């Protein structure tokens, strides 16, 4: 019922190998729907979901202009950042940006986000109030002072509470057959002996959307958090996600173990056992 | 759609 829109920007410098590469991807929930890549033969915003293809050429043109300008701004930022950390021109560095809005079932703004990382570390973030900044270190305090003098937050806020929510609402309606559909996990438990006296039980969740899921094993109804091998939720490539959780059990005690699955697509949690 | 006129860091 809740939804989000996010843009993710990455600029990577590469001294001796040209100017920094800029790439942006846009998501609604767990669905990517646009991309832009400054290394493309002819850089332009491109659709990556079916329900955004209907936007007119003025949409693609406008957004392409925006990304090209942003790429140039990120080049400036990367130069500034090297100075703020007393770094030489010889090393490669990364600037990441992520921003967007969360809305509830009624379409109303729940929370806005606008934040940055430099070489993988948090750098500066717009606070929840959308009026003030949190700087990670004295370099980022320089950015914060600049942005305070420029009243930079006011324009971020206007976008997050306005355009962001309005275009998210539009995308949700245009993509509603997919974006507002939860696909529940298809589940099953497998069993493989590892020795005469132990076996692996693996609980599988397949074909689910969105990616958020809880998969747990219990023994005699007690959570087995420490003893459970849990793989990171992974994309299948068909919009859906996969996950599994495994435990090693003494031979013959298999029926003491239950796998529990929670997902938005499930009315009630699933309890599963081997066979 | 993305935001524009964001300032440099």
């Amino acid at each position: 019922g809740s939804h989000s829109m996010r843009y993710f920007y990455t600029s990577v410098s590469r001294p001796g190998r040209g100017e920094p590469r800029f790439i942006s991807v846009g998501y609604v929930d767990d669905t990517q729907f646009v991309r832009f890549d400054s290394d493309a033969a002819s850089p332009r915003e491109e659709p990556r979901a079916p329900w955004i293809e209907q936007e007119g050429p003025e949409y693609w043109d406008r957004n392409t202009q925006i990304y090209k300008a942003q790429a140039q701004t990120d080049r400036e930022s990367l130069r500034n950042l090297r100075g703020y950390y007393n770094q030489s021109e010889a090393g490669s560095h990364t600037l990441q940006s992520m921003y967007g809005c969360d809305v509830g079932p009624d379409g109303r703004l729940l929370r806005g986000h606008d934040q940055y990382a430099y070489d993988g570390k948090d750098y500066i973030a717009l606070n929840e109030d959308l009026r003030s900044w949190t700087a990670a270190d004295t370099a980022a305090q320089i950015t914060q002072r600049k942005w305070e003098a420029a009243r930079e937050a006011e324009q971020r806020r206007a976008y997050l509470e306005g355009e962001c929510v309005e275009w998210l609402r539009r995308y949700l309606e245009n993509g509603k057959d997919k974006l507002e559909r939860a696909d529940p996990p298809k589940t099953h438990v497998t069993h493989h002996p590892i020795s005469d006296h132990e076996a692996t039980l693996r609980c599988w969740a397949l074909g689910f959307y969105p990616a958020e899921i809880t998969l747990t094993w219990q023994r005699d109804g007690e959570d087995q958090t420490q003893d459970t091998e849990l793989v990171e939720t992974r994309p299948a490539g068909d919009r859906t996600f996969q996950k599994w959780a495994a435990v090693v059990v003494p031979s013959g005690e298999e029926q003491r173990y239950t796998c529990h699955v929670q997902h938005e697509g499930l009315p009630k949690p699933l309890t599963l056992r081997w066979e | 759609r993305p935001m524009t006129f964001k300032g440099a860091l």
């Binding site: 991807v25 070489d119 993988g120 493989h192 990171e232 994309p235 299948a236 490539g237 | -």
Partner: protein, 99 residues
């Protein structure tokens, strides 16, 4: 400071010998973003493998999916081979149809 990739190799659908499927290699949790990924069939590089657009997680670490069509069989071995600045040698992870 750098972060080494997590690597998973798996199929889009549960594998059935003789039936067309997709072989996936998901790399995640890494930083910086430069990374090289090969899919292998019997030790040899599969050509024309596609990948997702570079994106990242809430903790800023990058992730990518590499994928290609394949038709599993009893005897063919599949694998992923990953190179990253954090790795002294390429890391090979074999495809195991129940992982």
């Amino acid at each position: 400071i750098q972060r080494t990739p997590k690597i998973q190799v798996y199929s889009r659908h549960p594998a059935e010998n003789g039936k067309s499927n997709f072989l996936n290699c998901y790399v995640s949790g890494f930083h910086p973003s430069d990374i090289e990924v090969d899919l292998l069939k019997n030790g040899e590089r599969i050509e024309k493998v596609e990948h997702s657009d570079l994106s990242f997680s809430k903790d800023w670490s990058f992730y990518l999916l590499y994928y290609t069509e394949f038709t599993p069989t009893e005897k063919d071995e599949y694998a992923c081979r990953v190179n990253h600045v954090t790795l002294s040698q390429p890391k090979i992870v074999k495809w195991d149809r129940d992982m």
